Amino acid sequence: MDSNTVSSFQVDCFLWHVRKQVVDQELGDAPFLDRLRRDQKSLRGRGSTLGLNIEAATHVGKQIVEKILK
Amino acid sequence: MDSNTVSSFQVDCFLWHVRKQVVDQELGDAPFLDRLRRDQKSLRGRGSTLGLNIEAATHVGKQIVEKILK
Secondary structure (H helix, E strand, O other): OOHHHHHHHHHHHHHHHHHHHHHHOOOOOHHHHHHHHHHHHHHHHHHHHHOOOHHHHHHHHHHHHHHHHO | OOHHHHHHHHHHHHHHHHHHHHHHOOOOOHHHHHHHHHHHHHHHHHHHHHOOOHHHHHHHHHHHHHHHHO
């Protein structure tokens, strides 16, 4: 497992969480919702394959993105 | 143009900008880079179709996401 495969997954988990909040705020259109559903399935499969816990990865992804937004 | 189609595009523009910064920080793997390239093409087409300026939309997307991260 390369370091970058791990950081890529972490980021994608956190961005998925942000997109889910946009949908819970009723700001997403139909195709945005469809991408959210498809990506959740994809992320779970990648998480299974890598053996990475999704909640843990989501939290590291948040830290990576906060570092970047600074 | 529905309100939600606009907020969905704004969010997607800003998240694309975040993903681009992850790649500039050398944190992305090959498939992460491939999704970045594919999505840039898709976003430009959606921006053209809607008549929305991508830089403007990116900045509103940032505000939407900051509201959510609070």
